[PDB]
């Protein structure tokens, strides 16, 4: 399977006035780990991040080409892009490749740059968007992640409880997947700050 070639997992999770996005740090080629600090979550704005699991080459290409489009949009418009509008932009970019798609399934997490309202979504690899009020997952251990999120997530969590929940969902999910892990990174997005942490995590 093309999507299991590099492995990897991302999720995002909604809280009261905040969002969280997380990712494993492994870059591998089938069984072989190459690197343990590979970037999968990319800033798209001060309070808006995109996480991409899938084929590593397209994780990078989609991030880069999305950035191209985003920078032009912001220079041309007056303003920072809204979360929903970033989703539509990504959707449009992936659907252009409908008959030969990028092998990545992004997740978006952010706050609206005026309201600061929490937003999360994910998209399939041809750009079907999917907005939710709880959590989204993407990657080789999606079933593991669904198990953890459906059992732990609660509404209206504060930044500290949201951090613990997303961290526990990631660590325990990826510990049941051979080709995801070698570290987990978590971003908590608040109105007034970004908290970025790497977790103590299994390295096998």
């Amino acid at each position: 399977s093309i999507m299991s070639y590099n492995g990897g997992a991302v999720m995002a999770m909604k809280g009261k006035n905040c969002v969280a996005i997380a990712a494993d740090r492994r870059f591998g080629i089938q069984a072989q780990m190459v690197t343990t600090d590979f970037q999968k979550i990319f800033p798209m704005g001060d309070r808006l991040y995109i996480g991409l699991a899938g084929l590593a080459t397209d994780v990078q290409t989609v991030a880069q080409r999305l950035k191209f489009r985003l920078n032009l949009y912001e220079l041309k418009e007056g303003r920072q892009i809204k979360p929903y509008t970033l989703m539509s932009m990504v959707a449009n970019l992936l659907y252009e490749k409908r008959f030969g798609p990028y092998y990545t399934e992004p997740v978006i997490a952010g706050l609206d740059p005026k309201t600061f309202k929490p937003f999360i979504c994910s998209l399939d690899l041809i750009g079907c968007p999917m907005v939710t009020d709880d959590f989204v997952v993407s990657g080789t251990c999606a079933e593991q992640m669904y198990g953890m999120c459906e059992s732990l997530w609660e509404p209206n969590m504060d930044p500290d409880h949201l951090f613990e929940t997303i961290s526990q969902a990631m660590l325990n999910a990826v510990d049941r997947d051979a080709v995801s892990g070698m570290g987990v990174i978590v971003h908590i997005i608040e109105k007034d700050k970004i908290t970025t942490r790497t977790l103590k995590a299994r390295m096998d």
Binding site: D124, L125, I126, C128, M130
Partner: peptide, 4 residues
């Protein structure tokens, strides 16, 4: 690919 998601289906309905």
């Amino acid at each position: 690919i998601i289906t309905x």
